[PDB]
From a paper:
The tripartite ATP-independent periplasmic (TRAP) transporters use an extra cytoplasmic substrate binding protein (SBP) to transport a wide variety of substrates in bacteria and archaea. The SBP (commonly referred to as the P-domain in TRAP transporters) is a soluble protein that freely diffuses in the periplasm of Gram-negative bacteria or is associated with the cell membrane in Gram-positive bacteria and archaea. It scavenges substrate molecules and delivers them to the membrane transporter. Since then, many more structures have been determined, confirming the general architecture of the P-domain as two globular lobes connected by a long backbone helix (red).
We searched the structural model of the HiSiaPQM complex for sites where the different domains can be locked in a given conformational state by intra-chain disulfide bonds. As shown in Fig. 1 (right), we selected two pairs of residues in HiSiaP (S44C/S171C and S15C/A194C) and named the two constructs HiSiaP CLOSED #1 and HiSiaP CLOSED #2, respectively. For both constructs, the thiol groups of the introduced cysteines would likely be in close proximity in the substrate-bound state, and the formation of a disulfide bond would therefore be expected to lock the SBP in this conformation. To verify that the disulfide-linked SBPs had the expected structure, we set up crystallization experiments of the H2O2-treated HiSiaP CLOSED #1/2 constructs. Heavily intergrown crystals of HiSiaP CLOSED #2 were obtained and single crystalline pieces could be broken off for diffraction data collection at the PETRA III synchrotron (DESY, Hamburg, Germany). A 1.9 Å data set (space group I222) was collected and the structure was solved by molecular replacement using the closed state of HiSiaP as a search model (PDB-ID: 3B506). A clear solution was found and inspection of the electron density map revealed density at the expected position of the disulfide bond and the sialic acid binding site, demonstrating that the disulfide bond had indeed been formed and the sialic acid molecule had been captured in its binding site. The two structures overlap with an r.m.s.d. value of 0.24 Å over 300 Cɑ atoms, and except for the introduced disulfide bond, there is no significant change between the backbone or side chain atoms of the two structures. We found that traces of a second conformation of C194 were visible in the electron density. The different position of the engineered cysteines along the edge of the substrate binding pocket explains the higher propensity of CLOSED #2 to spontaneously form a disulfide bond, even without an oxidation agent. Very clearly, HiSiaP CLOSED #2 preferably interacted with the IFS of HiSiaQM.
Author numbering: 1 to 310
């Protein structure tokens, strides 16, 4: 307890994100000879991820998770990461961030403007849609009161497929599902399982609409005060946690549909061509709203070859 550091997250203690942060935490403690202890604060105990990003910026929190897409809060063209159906697989998400001019500049702005250092990137699942009635095709989204996070790209997903979006914090979601204050939500299969949303949702549609990555972030105010050896400890441990993280989500996606079926959830596979078609005006509005910077970021993402990690 030379450094008593803290890691906040929206995920709960059953979740892949917690499990991976636990590995991060335990490895940092070991490979730092006990000089660094990391405590974990899940389930939004410190606020949502907008609050925790601000806490990293002002140095009041040491570590947290964010998606690349979340930086649309500060740079609207960064929403390109979460335009539904634009990023096809995790390979694309990795190259969008690290192997494009747009993404390399985002990392630099994250450092110089927002005070956060990007330690590592993991895969955080592809979002699906649960509901209290079957989504057999895009038609069934009409009138669906669909909970979304407080995030404009999730809002737009629900809106352009014809649903009625209802933003609310992740910690509020189980209650709203349980009482039918909303008709459904959208999250990767992992969250549907670890947050027990399947207990309170009879239907799951494979909409595959947004791919989530996950960034291991550290406050610059924290990172700068660590000796270089301990900086290296934290970076190595972040990278090792991220590979564990990704494997948890990949393996889970081979598996969880079966699990949910055992629980009595009905799985549908709606035709996704009309879903993808309905986003085309949204892409246009994005480019209209964000200008050259958004158009250029989108062209850069679109050109990435979906095949082969890097
Ligand atoms: C790093 C992080 O906190 N991810 C969280 C995301 C993002 O906030 C959202 O996708 C916008 O970026 O929202 C959830 O999926 C949600 O509330 O449904 C929970 C998840 O834990
Ligand atoms: Zn329409
Ligand atoms: Zn299937």
């Amino acid at each position: 307890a030379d450094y008593d550091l803290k890691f906040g997250m929206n995920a709960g203690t059953s979740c892949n994100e917690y499990k991976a942060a636990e590995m991060f935490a335990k490895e940092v403690k070991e490979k730092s000879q006990g000089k660094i202890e990391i405590s974990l604060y899940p389930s939004s105990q410190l606020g949502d991820d907008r609050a925790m990003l601000k806490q990293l910026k002002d140095g009041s929190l040491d570590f947290t998770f964010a998606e690349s897409a979340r930086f649309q809060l500060f740079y609207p063209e960064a929403a390109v990461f979460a335009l539904p159906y634009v990023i096809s697989n995790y390979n694309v998400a990795q190259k969008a961030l690290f192997d494009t001019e747009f993404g390399k500049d985002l990392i630099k702005k994250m450092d110089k403007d927002l005070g956060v250092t990007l330690l590592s990137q993991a895969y955080n699942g592809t979002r699906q849609t649960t509901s209290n009635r079957a989504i057999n095709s895009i038609a069934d989204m009409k009138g669906l009161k669909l909970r979304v996070p407080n995030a404009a790209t999730n809002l737009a997903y629900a809106k352009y497929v014809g649903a009625s979006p209802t933003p609310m914090a992740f910690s509020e979601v189980y209650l709203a599902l349980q009482t039918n204050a909303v008709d459904g939500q959208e999250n990767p299969l992992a969250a549907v399982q670890c947050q027990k949303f399947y207990e309170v949702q009879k239907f799951l549609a494979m909409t595959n609409h947004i791919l989530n990555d996950q960034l291991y972030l550290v406050s610059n105010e924290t990172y700068k005060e660590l000796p270089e050896d301990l900086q290296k400890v934290v970076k190595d441990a972040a990278e090792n946690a991220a590979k564990y993280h990704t494997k948890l989500f990949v393996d889970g996606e081979k598996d969880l549909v079966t699990f949910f079926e055992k629980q009595g959830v009905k799985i549908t596979h709606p035709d996704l061509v009309p879903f993808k078609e309905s986003m085309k005006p949204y892409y246009a509005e994005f480019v209209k709203q964000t200008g050259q910077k958004g158009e250029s970021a989108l062209k850069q993402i679109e050109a990435i070859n979906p095949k082969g990690e890097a």
